[PDB]
């Protein structure tokens, strides 16, 4: 058994982490007080869930996580929430003044003073691992901590844990749920300094989560709670292989091997379905073909874009629930005759498929209804470049006027780190177009 340490950075990371471990506990049968009845190995054991939880002599199952925020207000909810008994206080790190949505402030000014402290708390969780696989780092693009301090942490993690893998769950900025105007700047800054330090990253576009909540769940104005309970479902499906018995994606190394033939192009597109509102009396339970077919609809993508106009480099299908292999291939054939799937000429036109029999778990009183089967498709399409193209454009509109640049220089960043970062995205966009278009 090999452990996985999760790192949540900033408001977005911390709240999303809040909704993931809530879900992990409901899945693995862990109670809020940290007790797990089904675990017959008291205070020990190398089970599949032990990759994410540790055990004490008193039978407590403690997450292998670390929350970090440059401001205590958001993490303070965790210390007094329902799951306050899962973490010991050292796992929750907080400053006193945030980064004011300023990448420079999170990376240089305030980051320097707290980086050594974070690494040490992580060094404590690492010392408990008999074979640490890597790290899962949740954070946002727009936040000054989620962008500025993450890249600094990533840099140090590649120095103190060279051979370990690092996966990100990054939140793409969407104007519908953001009061910050400089988020483009932060996004491009953090993607530039993090790129070389992340082996695989799952972007989630808030605009996509927002619409999925309004269209499928009938939530006129969704809160972060709604967006996070949904985002954690995707996260749960993407990590299930690591926490359960199985054979596909059994450790973090398998995510790069199965989804990233080119290191820089390490941004897979996630898709999920079905998303059914619990307010509906009862719904016609979808078959394997119907939920698989839905994975090729734009409405169900974590990042809005048109996959019909790219080229796939790799592709996984993760099923949960009443699903058998015969039904999977059945739908696949039906779809390879209707859809537009253009593979790159240097990669096989194949799908790796994993099936977990336990259906998706839903939070009591939550927004999602209980389904008998569901699928999450991870596909590395050149079409996701549209995301970069949108963001890059907004960056160019402001940088042409040097708007808001002074807030960054005043924190110690040189104006050149902008154009340098931007020239790295221009390079990143080029690599996607060299791989996708004819």
């Amino acid at each position: 058994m090999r452990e996985c340490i999760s790192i949540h950075v900033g408001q977005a990371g911390v709240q999303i982490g809040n909704a993931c471990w809530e879900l992990y506990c409901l899945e693995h049968g862990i109670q809020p007080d940290g007790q797990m009845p089904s675990d017959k190995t008291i205070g020990g054991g190398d089970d599949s869930f032990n990759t994410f939880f540790s055990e004490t002599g008193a039978g407590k199952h403690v997450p292998r996580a670390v929350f970090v925020d440059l401001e205590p207000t958001v993490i303070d909810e965790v210390r007094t929430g329902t799951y306050r008994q899962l973490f010991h206080p050292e796992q929750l790190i907080t400053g006193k003044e945030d980064a004011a949505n300023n990448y420079a402030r999170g990376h240089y000014t305030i980051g320097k003073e707290i980086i050594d402290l974070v690494l040490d708390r992580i060094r404590k969780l690492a010392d408990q691992c008999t074979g640490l696989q890597g790290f899962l780092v949740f954070h946002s693009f727009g936040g000054g901590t989620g962008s500025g301090f993450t890249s600094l942490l990533m840099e140090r993690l590649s120095v103190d844990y060279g051979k370990k893998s690092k996966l990100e769950f990054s939140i793409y900025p969407a104007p519908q749920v953001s009061t910050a105007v400089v988020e483009p700047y932060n996004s491009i800054l953090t993607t530039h300094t993090t790129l070389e330090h992340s082996d695989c990253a799952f972007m989630v576009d808030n605009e996509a989560i927002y619409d999925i909540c309004r269209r499928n769940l009938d939530i006129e104005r969704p809160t972060y709670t709604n967006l996070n309970r949904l985002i954690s479902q995707i996260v749960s499906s993407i990590t299930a292989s690591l926490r359960f018995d199985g054979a596909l994606n059994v450790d973090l190394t398998e995510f790069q091997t199965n989804l990233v033939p080119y290191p820089r192009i390490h941004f897979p597109l996630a898709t999920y379905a079905p998303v059914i509102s619990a307010e509906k009396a009862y719904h016609e339970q979808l078959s394997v073909a119907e939920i698989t077919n839905a994975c090729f609809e734009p409405a169900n993508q974590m990042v809005k874009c048109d996959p019909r106009h790219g080229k796939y480099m790799a592709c996984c299908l993760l099923y949960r629930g009443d699903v058998v292999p015969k039904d999977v291939n059945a739908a696949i054939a039906t779809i390879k005759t209707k859809r537009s799937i253009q593979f790159v000429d240097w990669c096989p036109t194949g799908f790796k498929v994993g099936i977990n029999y336990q259906p998706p778990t839903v939070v009591p009183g939550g927004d999602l209804a209980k389904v008998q089967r569901a699928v999450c498709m991870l596909s590395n399409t050149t079409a996701i470049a549209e995301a970069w193209a949108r963001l890059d454009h907004k960056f160019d509109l402001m940088y042409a006027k040097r708007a808001f640049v002074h807030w960054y220089v005043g924190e110690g960043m040189e104006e050149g780190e902008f154009s340098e970062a931007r020239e790295d995205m221009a390079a990143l966009e080029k690599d996607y177009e060299e791989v996708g278009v004819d």
Partner: protein, 425 residues
């Protein structure tokens, strides 16, 4: 714990600041003696941002009252909530400033400045984590203008990494105490361009015209004007005083509203504004057509004469937050010719469930528009009209000032207008 230190200087400063504390003290359920008697825990959630907690569950405003004559502050201490302020936080002299910037900034004020800072230091030392400062004051007079800017220049010297916010009343000839208000105003503007992060510009002419034309008062008084600034001051500080998903921080709001260090002069606005047909409920669309209308803005600048750099609207009341979003997007998408196209999504909206006293719902407007240049244009015009003949200069040169300093203040503001002009094209 993100505490703010309030400072009000001069006659206008303290009278406006007084009603400000009278307004929010009522919103947070604090009585005239400092005892809490509200009914919602939302009143106390962020109460320590503008109030210190004493013994016996007493809340003392974190305010510092400053003036060079005792007259005004005597009135505050005997006003409605006068007793609520810290006795030691009253710092004042007896010489007065004679409505002279030079006196407030160089002679009389200089003799009293060190003691004010001694109080500010006492308030900051007790702050767990100090957000920054906010100063109410006018620019036409001598104390709030002359000594006010002197305070900022010294507060920035001791707390260089804290936010410096101000509500500044601008002088208009139609609401003038003395003819030298352009001299005092031009001198203060240069200080604020350098040593402030955000400045809410309030034109006494706009306040008057709102009281005469919109509110239908046959004879407005400084008291009438001050009620508006009270409600407007409460409006823009809602993000800070009540809980919400916004996460409002003085440095976060500055980072999101000030694309350039010198263009930090905002036009505030309030809605509704009804004459006494006053109990009529207001739909969400109506709040928004008024909030963006010039007649509800208090800088006396027609936004249709410039372009918006950034806009921050706050809504208060139990309304359809879905309807709020739709209406803001409607105003943006119907006049996108007044919002610069090179700052994506430069309009942000915040909601708050607690309405101001005596209103089902309301909206407050905070715009960083280039039309504010028209403001500084008027001042620079009134200024040169007298400085070209050296008229009234003796009041100032007698206090040690040279004509050179005036010519500099002049150029510093004409540059500020040019800067506001290139971004409008």
């Amino acid at each position: 714990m993100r505490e703010i230190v309030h400072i009000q200087a001069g006659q206008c400063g303290n009278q406006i600041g007084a009603k400000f504390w009278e307004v929010i003290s009522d919103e947070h359920g604090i009585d005239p003696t400092g005892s809490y008697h509200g009914d919602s825990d939302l009143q106390l959630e962020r109460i320590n941002v503008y109030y210190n907690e004493a013994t016996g569950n007493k809340y003392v405003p974190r305010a510092i009252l400053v003036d060079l004559e005792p007259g005004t502050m005597d009135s505050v201490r005997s006003g409605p909530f006068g007793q609520i302020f810290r006795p030691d936080n009253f710092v004042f002299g007896q010489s007065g400033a004679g409505n002279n910037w030079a006196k407030g900034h160089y002679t009389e004020g200089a003799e009293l400045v060190d003691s004010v800072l001694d109080v500010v230091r006492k308030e900051s030392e007790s702050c767990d984590c100090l957000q920054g400062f906010q100063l109410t004051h006018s620019l036409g007079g001598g104390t709030g203008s002359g000594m006010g800017t002197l305070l900022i220049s010294k507060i920035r010297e001791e707390y260089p990494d804290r936010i410096m916010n101000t509500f500044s009343v601008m002088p208009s000839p139609k609401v003038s105490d003395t003819v030298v208000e352009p001299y005092n105003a031009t001198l203060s503007v240069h200080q604020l361009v350098e040593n402030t992060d955000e400045t809410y510009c309030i034109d006494n002419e706009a306040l008057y015209d709102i009281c005469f034309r919109t509110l239908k008062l046959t004879t407005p008084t400084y008291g009438d004007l001050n009620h508006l600034v009270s409600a407007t001051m409460s409006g823009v500080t809602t993000c800070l005083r009540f809980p919400g998903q916004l996460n409002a921080d003085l440095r976060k709001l500055a980072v999101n509203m000030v694309p350039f260090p010198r263009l930090h002069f905002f036009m505030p606005g309030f809605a509704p504004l009804t004459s006494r047909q006053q109990y009529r409920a207001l739909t969400v669309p109506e709040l928004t057509q008024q909030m963006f209308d010039s007649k509800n803005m208090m800088a006396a600048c027609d936004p249709r004469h410039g372009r918006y750099l950034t806009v921050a609207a706050i809504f208060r009341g139990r309304m359809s937050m879905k309807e709020v979003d739709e209406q803001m997007l409607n105003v943006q998408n119907k006049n996108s010719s007044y919002f610069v196209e090179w700052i994506p999504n430069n309009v942000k909206t915040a909601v708050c469930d607690i309405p101001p006293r005596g209103l089902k719902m309301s909206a407050t407007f905070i715009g960083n528009s280039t039309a504010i240049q028209e403001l500084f244009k008027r001042i620079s015009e009134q200024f040169t009209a007298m400085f070209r003949r050296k008229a009234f200069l003796h009041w100032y040169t007698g206090e040690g000032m040279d004509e050179m300093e005036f010519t500099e203040a002049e150029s510093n503001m004409n540059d500020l207008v040019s800067e506001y002009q290139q971004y409008q094209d």
